[PDB]
Design a protein around this ligand. Structure first.
Ligand SMILES: [Cl-]
Ligand SMILES: [Cl-]
Ligand SMILES: [Cl-]
Ligand SMILES: [Cl-]
Ligand code: NI
Ligand code: NI
Length: 944
């Protein structure tokens, strides 16, 4: 009983005889990309227009269809798919006959459970399985906060949060990746949602009585002791009202911050294998297992998150559990998952909560870059950001007046510390008019002048705009009358945090007609004043902070695309797309910039960067941003950033004996050391991510507010800011590469060392472009760190010039002032003169630094940095090629030309071969000078 085959112009459609999947479509999307759609029905038309994919089936791509016996082969020059005519399972081999991806079954459809809203008759819970018993490494998937780089063998929840961004693009150690084209909440690994502690474990209290012992304290005093199965204070139901309230006795201690708690008991897993544990919390929490600490975390009360770890447990054993949670007003819940079936332990699994079909894209590629490029091809080119966006950004939550912004920008300039951009956060409008986009006349009397003064200092300014509107405002009213307001937040009477609290709602971005009004409102009221960029905050959305995720789903129902759940991950894309499109409409020659706090497949097509949101000034959090950036980049989204120093510091840092802590001078003596060391190490890390940006709540975050002029830490911070600008020719080349070469800036070691398994798992190093191996110091008071030098390359210590071999893990010198940096032998690194902002360095003189010991290649990308002319071919490359055997650097014929490009360039070349005291002394280094005119010239390396 074999399937009928229909030969389409884009591939095949198999009609399966039995099983829940009735039809299976293969679509050739490009030379290396095949779409796979398993349908429990006969009408592919029931499947929604992609929010992620803008790419249509290819017309110019040759492909063959061969059929014989029980298999049906569909192949291109680069990819072949082998489908069984028996069950419908697809098998992908490369162009040279190797199994890259095998489907197990044909999928598992089942009822939609996690949707609070009435479900479409033809919607289902999706799940596809692949490659059982694989040794594969897995990467990408987006920005996550649990330290994973290689996801193999573990779970990821691809939900949407303040701190989390799902990009369902999975990259393999092998030569392929896939795009899971579902807009709802999706899960990698375990299909299930982590249940309460008590669902797959038996609980024993303090004595051993078969739930946990929950002691309640007010300060140090013991006030109650009962036992509960599921200790749960995870969510608000309504406004500031917990879902489960605190006992009569201490209901008061919660509000005043004296309440503290302890859990005590024992857990006995009932199955043998690897268990997952998740501690969802605010305030101070420490989980202890077996008389030893496993987790120690803290977060601001209003932005909790999950903190995870995996243990190997035996079915009969009992282990001792102790927790200590000082809620300081926040939330708590412990979750857990028990080991999956035996055959599913080592396999690839993807499942969504609602959809009409299993829909994904197989993407083949000989290198990881090639695979990102297939992602870029499906979801849209990552459009050029303006050049200034890769400069330093100074933000605060918040500058309170036109005066303050201009004062802080002037301080940088006065101190000759480089800076391109300053940011105006929320609350510049009249308090009772969020959504009006007006400027409070008390603090911001002349916005055009404010922008004008910023611009006169050769800087750019960005401004916050939410999707949030008060029903009192005209702008709300306009949107509401077209039916485009998400009004359930109003019925629920949810007040925000401003003053006595205001009623408020979020618009519905899933209609282009809706986003066109949105843009026209902000165009009419903000764009006319000439702001450079849009900080599109709160685009998860976070309509009301801390409600359940079902309630969050319920709140965006109805939207243009159906239920809240059917699109839980996709809000940021249609939204940013609307702003991008209006900008193009208004100024068809300038580059827009958007920073937005959430994404999904395709976000990069809106000229948007993302950041990880409200993280906390903690070391655990700085460490975790490494994997967060890595996974985002390997997901296909490179322009990424975070808050240097974290969004919210603990209270010890904000308030002191001297009152409100603005400058570090107002800190409690004992606190200064750590605040200065945290920011020093974080600024170091920050200068080596795609966007370099200081922001957060008090204390103030300008370099001169973190420490005094002349001190070690001030000097270390100024230095890396300066380095960032010295490196701008290198960096902005990455910048151009993101678009023209479908490039990726923040690189997981697997991209550049894919044959090195040890490198796969590393979660605290990475490649910053092709040359730099970045190794942030993430431990308070550490003055060295272990650093793995990947095999197959030699490495130079960037600062000293000492040359080490790879294949080893060194103990790298990491004094406070320096983050361990190593250059890959064979790198060609261009630097420019010291500049204070990107345009100053246009057409600048170059130092070309060649790190000998291997061949090298770097093409310097240059253009005007601001315009769209690059799209009509207005840009240039200056090709650099280095042969280690001849010791010769060829600076090739200049390719291209753009408006305002200099024909002549003063370029000087030097070669590092081992230790040199001038390793970073760019201005004074011995270098051979060249007057380059676009014509190829050669520079020999010095003798012996
Ligand atoms: Cl200037
Ligand atoms: Cl200037
Ligand atoms: Cl200047
Ligand atoms: Cl200048
Ligand atoms: Ni201007
Ligand atoms: Ni200047």
């Amino acid at each position: 009983a074999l399937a009928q085959v229909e030969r389409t112009a884009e591939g095949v459609v198999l009609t399966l005889p039995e099983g829940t999947v009735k039809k299976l479509r293969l679509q050739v999307m490009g030379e290396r990309i095949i779409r796979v759609t398993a349908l429990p029905g006969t009408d592919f038309g029931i499947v929604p227009e992609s929010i992620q994919v803008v790419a249509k089936p290819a017309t110019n791509v040759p492909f063959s269809v061969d059929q014989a016996g029980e298999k049906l082969v569909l192949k291109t020059s680069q990819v072949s798919a082998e489908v069984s005519l028996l069950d419908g399972t697809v098998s992908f081999r490369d162009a040279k006959g190797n199994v890259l991806l095998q489907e197990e079954n044909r999928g598992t459809f089942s009822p939609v459970i996690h949707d609070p809203d009435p479900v479409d008759a033809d919607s289902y819970a999706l799940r596809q399985e692949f490659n059982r018993g694989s040794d594969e490494g897995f990467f990408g998937l987006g920005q996550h906060q649990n330290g994973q780089v290689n996801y193999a063998g573990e779970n990821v929840e691809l939900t949407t949060y303040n701190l989390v961004i799902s990009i369902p693009f999975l990259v393999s150690s092998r030569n392929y990746g896939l795009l899971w084209d579902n807009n709802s909440i999706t899960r990698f690994g375990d299909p299930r949602e982590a249940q309460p502690l008590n669902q797959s474990l038996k609980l024993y209290d303090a004595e051993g009585k078969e739930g946990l012992t929950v002691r309640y304290f007010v300060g140090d005093e013991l006030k109650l002791t009962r036992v509960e199965a599921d200790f749960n204070h995870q969510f608000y139901k309504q406004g500031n009202e917990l879902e489960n309230p605190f006992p009569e006795e201490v209901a008061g201690a919660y509000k005043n911050n004296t309440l503290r708690i302890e859990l005590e008991g024992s857990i006995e897993a009932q199955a043998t294998g690897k268990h997952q544990f998740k501690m969802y919390n605010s305030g101070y929490a420490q989980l202890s297992l077996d008389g030893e600490v496993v987790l120690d975390r803290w977060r601001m009360n209003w932005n909790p998150w999950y903190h995870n770890f995996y243990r190997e447990l035996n079915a009969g054993d009992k282990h001792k559990l102790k927790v200590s949670w000082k809620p300081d007003g926040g939330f708590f819940h412990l979750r857990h998952l028990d080991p999956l079936p035996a055959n599913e332990q080592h396999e690839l699994s993807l499942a969504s909560e609602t959809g009409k079909a299993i829909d994904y894209y197989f993407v083949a590629g000989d290198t990881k870059d090639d695979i990102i490029s297939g992602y870029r091809q499906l979801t849209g080119k990552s459009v050029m950001l303006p050049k200034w966006a890769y400069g330093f950004w100074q933000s605060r939550e918040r500058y309170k007046s036109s005066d303050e912004i201009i004062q802080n920008l002037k301080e940088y300039r006065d101190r000759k510390i480089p800076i391109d951009n300053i940011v105006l956060d929320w609350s510049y409008w009249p308090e009772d008019a969020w959504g009006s986009h007006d400027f409070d006349k008390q603090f911001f009397p002349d916005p055009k002048a404010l922008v004008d003064k910023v611009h006169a200092m050769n800087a750019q300014i960005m401004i916050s705009v939410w999707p949030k509107f008060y029903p009192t405002t005209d702008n709300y009213k306009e949107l509401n009358a077209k039916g485009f307001m998400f009004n359930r937040n109003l019925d629920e009477k949810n007040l925000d945090w401003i003053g006595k609290g205001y009623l408020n709602a979020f618009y519905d971005p899933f209609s282009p007609e809706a986003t066109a009004i949105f843009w026209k409102q902000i165009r009419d009221k903000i764009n006319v004043h000439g702001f450079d960029a849009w900080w599109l905050d709160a685009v998860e959305p976070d309509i009301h902070s801390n409600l359940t995720f079902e309630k969050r789903k319920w709140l965006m129902t109805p939207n243009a695309r159906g239920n809240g759940a059917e699109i839980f991950n996709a809000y940021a894309v249609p939204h940013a797309e609307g702003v991008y499109q209006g900008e193009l409409a208004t100024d068809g020659d300038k580059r827009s910039f958007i920073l937005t706090r959430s994404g999904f497949g395709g976000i990069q097509r809106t000229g948007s960067a993302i950041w990880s949101g409200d993280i906390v000034s903690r070391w655990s959090d700085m460490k975790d941003q490494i994997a967060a950036g890595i996974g985002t980049n390997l997901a296909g989204v490179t322009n990424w950033t975070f808050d240097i120093g974290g969004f919210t510091p603990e209270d010890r840092f904000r308030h002191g004996k001297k009152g409100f802590v603005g400058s570090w001078t107002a800190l409690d003596a004992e606190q200064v050391d750590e605040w200065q060391e945290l920011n020093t190490r974080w600024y170091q890390f920050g200068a080596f991510v795609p966007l370099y940006r200081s922001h957060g709540q008090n204390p103030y975050r300008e370099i001169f507010n973190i420490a005094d002029e002349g001190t070690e830490v001030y000097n270390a911070m100024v230095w890396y800011t300066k380095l960032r600008y010295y490196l701008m020719p290198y960096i902005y080349t990455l910048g151009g590469d993101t678009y023209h070469k479908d490039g990726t800036i923040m690189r997981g070691l697997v991209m550049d060392f894919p044959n090195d398994r040890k490198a796969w798992d590393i979660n605290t190093q990475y490649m910053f472009g092709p040359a730099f191996l970045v190794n942030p110091v993430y431990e308070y008071k550490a003055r060295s760190r272990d650093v793995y030098l990947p095999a197959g390359s030699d490495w130079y210590n960037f600062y000293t010039g000492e040359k080490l071999a790879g294949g080893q893990t060194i103990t790298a010198d990491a004094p406070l002032a320096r983050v361990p940096l190593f250059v890959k032998a064979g790198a060609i690194v261009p630097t420019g003169p010291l500049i204070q902002h990107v345009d100053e360095g246009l057409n600048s003189p170059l130092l070309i630094t060649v790190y000998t010991g291997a061949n090298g290649s770097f093409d310097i990308y240059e253009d005007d940095g601001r315009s769209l002319k690059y799209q009509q071919g207005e840009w240039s490359r200056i090709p650099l090629s280095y042969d280690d055997v001849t010791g010769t650097l060829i600076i090739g014929d200049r390719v291209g030309s753009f408006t305002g490009m200099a024909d002549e360039r003063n370029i000087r070349v030097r070669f590092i071969a081992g230790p040199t005291a001038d390793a970073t002394n760019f201005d004074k280094a011995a270098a051979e000078a060249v007057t380059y005119t676009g014509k190829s010239v050669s520079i020999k390396r010095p003798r012996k």
